[PDB]
Design a protein around this nucleic acid. Structure first.
Lengths: 225, 124, 341, 116, 421
RNA sequence: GCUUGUG
RNA sequence: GCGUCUAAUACCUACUGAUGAAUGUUACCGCAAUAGUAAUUGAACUUAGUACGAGAGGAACAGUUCAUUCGGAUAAUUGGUUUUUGCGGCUGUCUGAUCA
RNA sequence: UGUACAACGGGGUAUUGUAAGCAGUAGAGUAGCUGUGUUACGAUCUGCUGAGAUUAAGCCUUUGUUGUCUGAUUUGU
């Protein structure tokens, strides 16, 4: 399932697209080949929608969510929200979140059952995430970095944590999420795995620069095969 | 790269918007662009840290401007500006050296620099 | 400065005649090669930008456009041209015998003092048994290779303190010149609507005299402005109509507000007749006559083939820092005032 | 496209009009014609300026609170497109405009009673 | 780059360099002068011309020296490879000659600049300029042979394989073209002939392959019998941090007996026996088994007629070198067949649809009909989003039917009483 | 009816 | 032809401008011998991680999308700009006091 | 000598910002008559009052008031 792709000769796959177990989102860039790359590995099994946040191509890092629902920042226009709702099945919830910051994707790292957010995030934001997404919220940081969303990546089969994450932190995260976790790099030594790649319970997408050892590590940690 | 209102003068000092340990950047180069040269939001510029740890002093390194503070016409019509000039330091390949970026980050700059957007916590 | 546009002397007249006409073919139906209009201020436009490969594909783009009044134009005569080694030569001209008072005034510098004998004798001559006109038409058809139709703008329908109409020659872009003169026969004294020549998304070029300034100081003093200039690749966004409402409305805004800004245009009146909206600006100030033409060439580029998607048109008061779009909205937001009661 | 009430004057902010300010606190401040933006730059309190909507609402010159104000809330959760819903919303807005005008006229009449 | 030297600029032949320099100085420098010109003006003109010619010659010599690497300081393995391909002393002699010529040109130019300042007549200055130019030309021409030698060595160095002795690698060696050529032709993309004659290969052919996602490189020894080729093969076997895979033949291939191969192996054994040797063989076999007595060599019988087995040998060599709550997967995913890039029945991806319509260029894709709805007939909608200056999104919500009725009831509850008076 | 590249 | 850290940094005549007698008068329209002439460089998705290449690295055209420079234009939005000396406030301040 | 035009006025749109004056329970502070204890002076504040003013000398409209419409010279195949 592991596939190598690049959006307009760009290695940051996790920035131009957002993918989950129930839906996939990609930018509206002129190069449609990026959409075909996801279609080949997914087809019509799950909806693939062209969308943007405030017209930006960084929708991947501008939004966070899980299978239950998707969240968008305040910068998202009402037109974009209605387009997403029309193009997204009603089974998946949509809820706008208001905060001083805008980078929800970098601020919230979450999977289908647990969520990790900025310790100083909005008080009501944690409740909104717990309700809409139906996942636990933990005010914690990994690898001593505030931007857990981009640095780390989480799923149900596994999670590729920051390569610099300590052994004790990895063990604690695995015991909390009840899933295996291993520290490693992607995109030819890129420490920000979340921005460089996206992963779900049945598919993994990485940049073309991703070396074979990185692909093998991603396959092993997520137990694709 | 759509045109934006310039105005940053050569030699301008801007606040460092990353936790890499630096606090200001001395812009001395407008590399990446073709008369009085000037920088703009999202432009990669080589600069030297004036105030900060001695390690980063006296050595030129690439930097990306995240705030301009000068009124510019966004392609969506709405006029907007920042409170003060700010920038971030990164390698020529766009890999952010600073672990995290602080303060507002230009939407136009973040869009053209996916790596900066990933390390940018406050878009717009 | 650009040596190409030198010398920088003033334009010969307020109206800039068309230097060249678009290529001609003998297969397509007869149509007017150019149209006359008047510059009417400027306004902002916002719409979605459907453009493949663009960074702002399927995004919203805000840009400025100019508004040019284009009241229905009426034909008054036709001029035939024969080919000669010294260029085209005008062999004869014809008139419809029902020239309006405005065109008659164009032939006089002091209308009130004049006895108003503009076409009395010509009118009497036309009233014969067709011999004096049929012969001229046959002679024009037999020899003329290209036929130009004389038309003028209905100045009386424009909010301008000028009864003097503008008379300019308009060429025909095709029609097997026999059918050109046949069409001219069917259009004498008739009016041609803007929508019957131009259309939305069509690429046109404009020729007019830009704003003048007077004496100005190549490191030498001279005249600045007030020169004929041709601007090409001007896209027509909206084609206005003077016989229906919703002139400024769109499928998105769908409001019943007219394109005329609140309080009227600055230094200009109100647009009620047919008008044309084109992106960018035309080299001409307000209350200035301008002419439109189809770029003289076939524009197959995307900028031409792309279809506009007008979303909303700004109609706030250009007079000062206007904010309210319609009087009803201003009243609702501001509420009743001492002026009302 | 979006329209927002000016942070200072509360007047509508049509596209391509006014200016926006992004302070270090990272929130969007929409402004109307320059006058009020410059007034904001002076830290003037809109609740005390006689000529601004904020003071009038606070001072009770115009109806401070009304049922019609709750119908103009910007919905957060998106709603699936429905042409019938669109038409009904258009009709409701058309009726609400007249209702708001009548209520504002009544409030103005009840405020000018002191002239007797 | 220490592993490659293709960046070296092409050397200019004897006549080519002088002519190029003379043309360059003639074109750039001024050309028109008169006897009536001031003495200082003529001085400056001739001095500038001579100095520009000298700087051009110096730049050419410096570029030539910089491009060509110093054999001694490159690498012991590369140094020995060059010493096998050429003569180290001769190469150093050529480099020293180039450096001496450059220094002499610099000295002559400086002296003539210091000397031309005392000329009187225009012809005297012209003669001094000719003196400097002729001295430079003679110095350049004196290097006619070393220039050609540098050109020839440059033409060959740029095509040499760029191997890395430090990384793990395997070496294949044996008698000339015993079959190892086929082994290389099947273990890597490198294409080498296997013609029966002895020296089918005359260079260290190199190929790369990946084992366990670990990069590996293999080098094909041309052959071993002294000769330059044999010395190069010996140096490659010794200096390189790589195992050596000896090749033998149980059959009559190459027309050489097993005894000769055994004798050659014993003769060369001392300097590679400790490098984890392996022997590949393509009633005398009893004597051949004597090699097994060596602690560091192992033998496995095989043949080139079954070259499909090269994978096992490669794996053995690589191993020897190295040793030295349930998830939420929709049922649709687990039912749809995996996409086949070449199946005629494969679903048409959006890429094909875009290409047919015109691609990402002249044609723009449309999102209509892509978004789900209760009914697909009314998919064509404009979504006005604005009405009478009020955003529709501020009023677009369900249940508005009851809200409007309640508002109308409230309005009726006040119109009857005339509260609006 | 001067001038330009090879002591 | 165009530029020269970037792709690269080898006392009277002429002049631009503006009047003006003329031929039957005035006015409208049109042709053009003639003098000048302009656009400019780069990147960006394609085609590509394809051809090429053991590898390292990595083509090009058709098409499309952007920016620098130079020229002709516009105030539709923003800034500048105010003898509109327009408004409101304030400093010294007079018409006896308060407005003005 | 009629959709003719000029000067005012009205209306539309805009700039500034709540006016001269009136009345008050809101009232610094002083006096009287010892507890809004009471009443005069009276800084300010409240309602009239998004009120007042400006509005083309290069804004728009005009139905309202009102005035004007004839002074010399030149030009011919």
């Amino acid at each position: 399932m592991a596939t190598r792709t690049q959006f307009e000769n760009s290695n940051e796959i996790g920035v131009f697209s957002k993918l989950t177990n129930t839906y996939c989102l990609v930018a509206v860039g002129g190069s449609e080949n990026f959409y075909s790359a996801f279609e080949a590995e997914l087809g019509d099994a799950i909806p693939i929608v062209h969308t943007t946040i405030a017209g930006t191509r960084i929708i991947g890092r501008m939004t966070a969510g899980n299978r239950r629902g998707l969240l968008v920042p305040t910068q998202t226009t009402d037109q974009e929200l209605q387009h997403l709702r029309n193009s997204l099945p009603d089974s998946v919830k949509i809820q706008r979140v208001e905060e001083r910051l805008s980078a929800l994707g970098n601020v919230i790292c979450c999977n289908d059952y647990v969520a990790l957010v900025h310790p100083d995030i909005d008080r009501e934001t944690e409740e909104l995430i717990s309700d809409v997404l139906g996942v636990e919220v933990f005010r914690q940081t990994i690898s001593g970095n505030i931007l857990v969303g981009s640095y780390c990546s989480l799923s149900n089969q596994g999670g590729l944590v920051h390569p610099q994450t300590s052994v004790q932190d990895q063990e604690e995260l695995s015991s909390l999420l009840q899933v295996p976790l291993v520290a490693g790099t992607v995109n030819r030594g890129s420490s920000v795995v979340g921005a460089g790649m996206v992963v779900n319970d049945y598919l993994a997408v990485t940049g073309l620069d991703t070396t074979a050892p990185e692909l093998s590590v991603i396959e092993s940690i997520f137990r694709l095969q | 790269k759509f045109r934006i209102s310039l105005g940053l003068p050569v030699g301008a000092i801007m606040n460092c918007a990353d936790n890499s340990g630096a606090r200001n950047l001395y812009i001395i180069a407008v590399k990446g662009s073709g008369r009085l040269p000037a920088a703009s939001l999202g432009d990669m510029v080589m600069a030297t840290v004036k105030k900060g740890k001695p390690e980063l002093r006296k050595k030129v390194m690439p930097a990306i401007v995240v705030r301009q503070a000068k009124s510019w016409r966004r392609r969506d019509g709405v006029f907007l500006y920042f409170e003060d000039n700010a920038g971030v330091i990164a390698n020529p390949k766009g890999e952010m050296k600073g672990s995290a970026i602080t303060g507002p980050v230009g939407k136009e700059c973040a869009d053209l620099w996916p790596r900066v957007a990933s390390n940018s916590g406050v878009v717009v | 400065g650009h040596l190409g546009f030198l010398p920088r002397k003033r334009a010969a007249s307020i109206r800039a005649r068309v230097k060249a006409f678009p290529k001609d073919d003998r297969s397509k139906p007869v149509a007017l090669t150019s149209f006359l209009g008047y510059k009417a201020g400027m306004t902002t436009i916002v719409r979605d930008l459907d453009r493949p490969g663009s960074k702002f594909h399927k995004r919203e783009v805000v840009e400025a456009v100019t508004v040019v009044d284009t009241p229905p134009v009426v034909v008054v005569g036709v001029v035939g041209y024969v080919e000669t080694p010294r260029g085209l030569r005008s062999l004869t001209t014809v008139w419809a015998e029902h020239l309006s008072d405005e065109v008659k005034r164009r032939f006089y510098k002091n209308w009130y003092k004049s006895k108003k004998k503009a076409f009395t004798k010509y009118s009497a001559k036309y009233a014969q048994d067709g011999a004096g006109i049929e012969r001229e038409l046959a002679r024009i058809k037999k020899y003329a290779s290209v036929v130009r139709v004389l038309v003028h703008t209905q100045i009386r329908k424009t909010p301008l303190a000028q009864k003097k109409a503008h008379l300019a020659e308009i060429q025909l872009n095709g029609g097997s010149i026999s059918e050109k003169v046949d069409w001219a026969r069917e259009h004498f004294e008739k009016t041609v609507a803007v929508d019957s020549v131009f259309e939305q998304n069509e690429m046109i070029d404009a020729i007019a005299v830009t704003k003048g300034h007077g004496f100005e100081g190549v490191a030498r003093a001279g005249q600045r402005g007030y020169h004929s200039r041709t601007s090409i690749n001007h896209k027509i966004y909206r084609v206005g109509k003077g016989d229906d409402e919703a002139n400024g409305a769109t499928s998105f805004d769908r409001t019943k507000k007219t394109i005329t800004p609140m309080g009227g245009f600055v230094h200009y009146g109100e647009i009620k007749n047919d008008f044309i909206m084109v992106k960018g600006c035309i080299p001409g100030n307000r209350k200035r006559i301008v002419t439109l033409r189809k770029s003289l060439y076939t524009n197959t580029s995307r900028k031409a083939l792309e279809e506009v998607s007008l979303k909303w048109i700004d109609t706030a008061s250009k007079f000062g820092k206007g904010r309210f779009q319609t009087p009803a909205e201003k009243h609702a937001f501001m509420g009743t005032l001492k002026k009302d009661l | 496209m979006r329209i927002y009430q000016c942070h200072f004057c509360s007047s509508p902010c049509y596209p391509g009009h006014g200016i926006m300010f992004v302070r270090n606190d990272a929130k969007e401040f929409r402004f109307c014609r320059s006058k009020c933006h410059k007034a904001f730059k002076q830290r003037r309190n809109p609740r005390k300026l006689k000529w601004t909507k904020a003071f009038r609402k606070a001072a009770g010159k115009e109806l401070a609170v009304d049922s019609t104000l709750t119908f103009a809330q910007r919905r957060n959760v998106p709603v699936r497109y429905n042409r019938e819903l669109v038409a009904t919303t258009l009709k409701a807005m058309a009726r609400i405009e007249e209702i708001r005008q009548k209520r504002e006229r009544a409030f103005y009449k009840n405020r000018m009673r002191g002239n007797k | 780059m220490q592993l490659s030297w293709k960046d070296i600029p092409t050397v200019a032949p004897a006549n080519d360099l002088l002519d190029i320099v003379l043309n360059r100085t003639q074109r750039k420098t001024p050309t028109v002068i008169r006897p009536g010109f001031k003495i200082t003006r003529i001085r400056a003109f001739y001095m500038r011309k001579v100095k520009y010619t000298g700087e051009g010659f110096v730049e050419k010599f410096e570029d030539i020296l910089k491009g060509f690497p110093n054999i001694n300081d490159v690498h012991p393995f590369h140094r020995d490879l060059m010493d096998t391909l050429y003569e180290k002393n001769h190469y150093k002699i050529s480099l020293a000659a180039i450096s001496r010529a450059k220094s002499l040109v610099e000295q002559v130019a400086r002296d003539y600049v210091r000397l031309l300042k005392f000329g009187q007549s225009l012809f005297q200055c012209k003669q001094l300029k000719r003196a400097a130019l002729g001295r430079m030309a003679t110095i350049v021409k004196k290097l006619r042979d070393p220039l050609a030698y540098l050109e020839q060595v440059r033409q060959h160095i740029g095509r040499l394989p760029s191997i890395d002795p430090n990384t793990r690698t395997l070496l294949i060696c044996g008698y000339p073209n015993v079959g190892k050529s086929s082994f290389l032709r099947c273990i890597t993309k490198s294409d080498v002939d296997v013609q029966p004659y002895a020296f089918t290969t005359k260079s260290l052919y190199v190929g790369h392959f990946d084992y366990k996602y670990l990069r590996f490189q293999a080098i094909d020894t041309p052959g071993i019998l002294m000769n330059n080729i044999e010395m190069q093969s010996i140096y490659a076997i010794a200096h390189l941090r790589s195992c050596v895979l000896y090749f033998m033949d149980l059959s009559e291939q190459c027309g050489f007996t097993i005894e000769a191969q055994v004798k050659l192996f014993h003769s060369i054994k001392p300097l590679f026996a400790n490098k984890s040797v392996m022997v590949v063989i393509n009633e005398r076999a009893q004597l051949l088994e004597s090699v097994k007595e060596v602690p560091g060599v192992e033998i496995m019988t095989s043949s080139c007629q079954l070259e499909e087995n090269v994978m096992e040998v490669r794996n053995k060599a690589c191993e020897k070198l190295l040793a030295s709550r349930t998830p939420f997967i929709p049922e649709s995913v687990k039912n749809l067949k995996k996409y086949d890039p070449e199946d005629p029945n494969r679903r048409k991806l959006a890429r094909d649809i875009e290409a047919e319509n015109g691609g990402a260029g002249v044609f723009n894709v449309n999102l209509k009909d892509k978004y789900l709805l209760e009914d697909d007939e009314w998919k064509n909608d404009i979504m006005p989003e604005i009405l009478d200056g009020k955003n529709v999104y501020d009023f677009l919500d369900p249940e508005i039917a009851a809200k409007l009725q309640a508002l109308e009831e409230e309005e009726e509850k006040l119109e009857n009483e005339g509260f609006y008076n």
